[model samples]
Target: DWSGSVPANAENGKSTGLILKQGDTISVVAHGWVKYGRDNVEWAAPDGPVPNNPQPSSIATLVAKIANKKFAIGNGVLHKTVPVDGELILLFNDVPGTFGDNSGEFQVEVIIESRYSPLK
Candidate 1:
């Protein structure tokens, strides 16, 4: 298991030292809002909001990369199984598909479980 505060910048990629097994049960969850909106604008969480929020103009979706594979994680949790084994990389995809105007970061946690199937 590994965890860190990940930036909302889509241009930025963070790789975790957690390596995956062929059938490792992997899950990712994150919280916090990307720094956006005017000086008077503020919001909370990733479930999406309005009236001075990051969801309006930015996709603000958490993304994951394993080896060369990628997954668009929504609702915070990645909730899935790995098809391959490799290092994990993460980022947030923003509007215009770039993180140029985005600020702030999400505290992310990665959960790994053993599939435990000797052969299946």
Candidate 2:
């Protein structure tokens, strides 16, 4: 049951976002806090004087990463032939995790770039 249930209209939401160019490697760096149950203590005491449901928060962070990978796309977006050829899709979910057990609240950024191609 831990595999995570699909959200409403997941098929449509799954591939949501603009595409990036191809041949560009990507990595993600995320940072945030997660609260268990209705304990929104982290937001109240962000200074860390409080424990802030540390255990569940840590677990949720790990789960967030898994969710990201699960929804990952391969070959992302492909563009047709033009002056230059390119293929890649990059985007961030930026979606908050639901339920008290887990949450995906975090700051995520995406990077895009183009490779060189010239006429023969």
Candidate 3:
């Protein structure tokens, strides 16, 4: 589960580290909530440096997005196999000044389920 406070800076960012495997079809189910007001959040897959693309191409491909809303939560599944193999990262960025001066907190719970299992 991804649970933490989002920084107050509009440019600030957070991540889920590296989890799961690539090239395998899986589902990313998640739920999220903000301490106060609506804010924007982006889930960047693989690689991280904040405000940057997860991939080397520099084009940020958002696996999921939390738009302008409070107490936000949702889930999605990725059926197609990924072309590359690497770690997956989630970039949670909250818009600045939205929640006043407070570096608001957010709770995000995620579950990644894979349909395929490796043979013994």
RMSD of each: 3.7, 11.6, 10.7
Clashes in predicted model 3? 2
Backbone collisions counted per model: 1, 6, 2
The CA lDDT at 101 in model 3 is 35
- Output the TM-score of candidate 3: 0.36
Per-candidate Cα lDDT values, in order, are 0.65, 0.28, 0.36
lDDT of 2 by residue, 36-63 (tens): 3354553311111134434333222221
Clashing residue pairs, backbone N/CA/C < 3 A, model 1: 35-103
Considering lDDT, where higher is better, how would the candidates rank from best to worst? 1, 3, 2
Error of 3 at 63 (Å): 4.7
Question: Which pairs of residues collide in candidate 3?
Answer: 46-88, 46-89
| Residue range 1-120, candidate 3, lDDT tens digits | 343433322233445553445445544443332322322433332222134323233322223322311111223344544334444443333333432532333333344445346687
TM-score of 2: 0.30
